[PDB]
Amino acid sequence: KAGFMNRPAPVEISYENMRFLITHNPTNATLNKFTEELKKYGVTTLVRVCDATYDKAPVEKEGIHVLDWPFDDGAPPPNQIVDDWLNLLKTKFREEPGCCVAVHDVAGLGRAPVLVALALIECGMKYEDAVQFIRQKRRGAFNSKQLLYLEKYRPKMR
């Protein structure tokens, strides 16, 4: 018994001239207010990691690049998808330094805060400081698998 509109508000992460936002999954009637929050935080790029339960037509009509990169639940992202992530942030962070990139799963306690966590470890921040930062922003971030993956992976790519 979980909720859809009962999750807490999206969280903004700022680190080393980078701005992310972890948020949750909307539903057809909601996206007016959701993308309202998107434009509020200044997000130019949204990465959907859960299954498609909303129409990308509105959010792309507002002028937000949306990227359907799903993978199985409870699992770490594949290497293809972390590639795409890192390069994506290189491009969209090269186009406007200070732009917020947003990412969402069912609720922002899954693969989305994992991807922003990898993005945090590659920008120079420690693993413990990263995970404690993210779940200090919204409690209960990741499962055991995602945390072990988060520890056992090494950064090199600016």
- Residue of the chain from 111, 116, 133, 150 that contacts other proteins (CB under 8 A): 111
**Residues between 36 and 95 with contacts to other proteins, criterion CB under 8 A:** 73-74
105 forms part of the interface with other proteins (CB under 8 A): yes
Least distance in angstroms from the C-beta of 98 to other proteins: 29
Cβ proximity to other proteins: between 64 and 146 the closer is 146
d(CA 9, CA 11): 7
- Residue of the chain from 143, 149, 153, 155 that contacts other proteins (CB under 8 A): 143
Q: For strands 19-23 and 43-48, give the pairing.
A: unpaired
**Residues between 6 and 25 with contacts to other proteins, criterion CB under 8 A:** 6-8
Q: 8 is written with which tokens?
A: 């807490």
Strand order of the sheet with strand 65-68? Answer: 11-14, 19-23, 100-104, 43-48, 65-68
- Residue of the chain from 144, 152, 154, 157 that contacts other proteins (CB under 8 A): 144
Q: What is the 3-state secondary structure (H, E, C) of 62-93?
A: CCCEEEECCCCCCCCCCHHHHHHHHHHHHHHH
| Cα torsion through 110, 57, 37, 54, rounded to 10 | -40
Least distance in angstroms from the C-beta of 79 to other proteins: 19
Where along the sequence are the contacts to other proteins (CB under 8 A)? 1-8, 73-74, 105-107, 109-111, 139-146
